[PDB]
């Protein structure tokens, strides 16, 4: 068996989102990014000549990205945000008493503590493994999945899981 490593990356694996960083003793102003996601994996070349079909990887990266795209990214588990439900909005109050309010539908609530590149990457890695399907990955012999998320062209975080 011959090992190969596949990489899929594209301006199309994008989610254009608003966010702000907040942690103890610090709060950034509201802003946004064209986040970009690449996926790298490793398996054996199968009898059909692929480790896994690029088209499927492109399809599922696109799908995960599309869920986040055009939303404010709202961390569910932050210890420094007070997140209130007010009518059809989320009202967010910070430790410096700064206050924000967005329509709930404008927000994507993600099970992370900080809208950092690192934590977004871990979330996307887990979602990608679910969307492509872990049993399907194993039928193709894939044993390594790795996600890189960039906030901008100049700063990236990369996380992996051995499967």
């Amino acid at each position: 068996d011959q090992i190969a490593e596949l990489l899929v990356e594209s301006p199309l694996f994008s989610f254009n989102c608003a966010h702000f960083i907040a942690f103890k003793g610090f709060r950034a102003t509201l802003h946004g990014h064209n986040y970009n996601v690449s996926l790298r994996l490793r398996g054996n070349i199968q009898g059909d000549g692929y480790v896994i079909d690029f088209s499927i990887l492109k399809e599922k990266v696109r799908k995960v990205c599309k869920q986040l795209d055009h939303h404010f990214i709202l961390p569910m588990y932050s210890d420094v945000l007070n997140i209130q439900e007010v009518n059809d909005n989320f009202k967010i109050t910070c430790e410096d008493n700064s206050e924000y309010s967005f329509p709930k539908r404008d927000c994507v609530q993600i099970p992370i503590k900080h809208s950092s590149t690192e934590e977004i990457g871990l979330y996307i890695l887990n979602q990608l493994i679910e969307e492509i399907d872990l049993p399907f990955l194993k039928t193709r012999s894939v044993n390594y999945m790795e996600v890189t998320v960039s906030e901008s062209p100049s700063q990236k975080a990369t996380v992996h899981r051995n499967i």
Copy 2:
């Protein structure tokens, strides 16, 4: 006299901002972009061997970009937004009755009608001409200034002025 056209462009001429599009009968969800700005100009090669020093162009593009960077871009002259001052926030109400509220300090109020790439480009062109200084441009023989703004790598608007 020999004409030359200068172009300055960089991942550094960036402003990472939140915005949303709204015009009659339409409203986008809140999101954001890594906007990128390039500047192109035309003049004669001067006795010092430059049309104008690249370093100055880089300095002033950086300065304009830095004013917008890390803010929500708020159009001053929109006919479809109701912009209210509430304590230290701007409260924005849309035609579909969607409601947003941001700290005023998180916002940059710009004299445009829509936070589109085109209108942002016209604004930045005017600001760049002021920052570099129109008389200084004319001492260097510059007769054309042109700004390109990209919302993402795949979509750009370009505006110019003959000076």
Copy 3:
């Protein structure tokens, strides 16, 4: 009224095709390219804040590209190819008596003389104007349409029409 120039470009505006160059006294071997298409246009900024919506330009460039993608590009009007219909294939005979045969369904017959970048560009420009629709372009005030086609990252042809 303020003029703006819009550019849309992307790794997504691609057609991955086979072709070969043939003209009098010359014939290239069969090969292929990831062709890439960009579109540039000029009009006035409309009351909605756009010259024309980027999404529409992306949609129609994608559509034209998709018709050509994954096919052998077969020039209809070449003076140096003998193109024969044999069962469900096109058989192509060159001036040096070289012979090719492809399933007709693997081929896209294009009303050009040479599968050059220049002639492909003129064809795509005409198709893009039809797909976006010339009357619709004029309602948005667009007066200039320009297509760039690249055979590879290092060689491009650009054609335009004043409308």
Copy 4:
């Protein structure tokens, strides 16, 4: 001894080829790509200050690429193609009875089963090791050779050998 990893990559390490994918129960239409090859290696920094001279790596990557460039890539060992020699052409018949015919000189016969990126990568890795020369690599202390092949900017396969 200090380890260093060298990477050579360029738009010049290209082969612009036609191909089609075929495996059991599937056949793509004829098309093509600007394939691109990068080479990465690891060794110790030698007394001359190089692990190995970049110029040699560039020379040999260029040479391998040039053998494939401007040809139809024909897999020698496919279990789903019937490859016939007819006069000075190869006639290829697929499982769905689709038929192709190319001049033999337009084709490069490669000892692979599928013209996939993965299998092309393994072939190029083996050829690069022969062209640079395995004993010469070992005199420079190189212990790792790795090839990345891209079908297009957005999809790549990477293979390696420990030497």
Copy 5:
């Protein structure tokens, strides 16, 4: 007749040179750049399907670049450098009495006043027109030649001539 505009550009159209800027009241320290050159032209599509063959443009841009590559660029006509021939070296004395000495063979003497991007561009434009040959350009119907030179990815000068 249909007009087309051709562009050739590549990491290969490079000259990696040392230089320093000097003009009245100013002198930069010795340093260097990977200069990059692109060529754009305009003519009619000819009966062979090309305005002019890309391969020729690539060949001649390469040739001009190769003459400059791996040398110190020495302006022949500077009003602020004292250039002395000392044995087999050029000794250069600046207005601040700074002194440099290089082997003559390490230098390329260019008929410019300043080693600026603008003046280098004008020189390369003139050399490219000579290398491709002005009569040959006119037989292909080319009526516009334009050169862009970049000192680094972020700063470029563009010059043209109507022929």
Copy 6:
């Protein structure tokens, strides 16, 4: 604890320098490059949501690059250069008796043997670890630091240290 790998890279992490290669039996002519530096590291995601703040990495890469930028890179420990102090210049004599002279202030003396990409990379890795501060790195849980230096877009050397 979750591991993440951070990458910072930018056209801004540049030093535009002159140099020449010399080793036993060989000497290159004087020339230069836009060198580019990227930094990759690995640690655990901290309670603030970062492995380490990108801004600090960008700040210190910039600082190291700025020390080298706009200078001739002069290796301190070369066995094939005779480096003489003459008034306020360094005079360099090669094994073929070629002679150079530069103002000392135009030169950066680096504790390397060859101005190769590999040795420059090892030097920059060591300097980056000092500038960011090794104890500070360990408080953020960083256990791996890796530097890539490119002489041009097409040739790179990568070195690392486990900390």
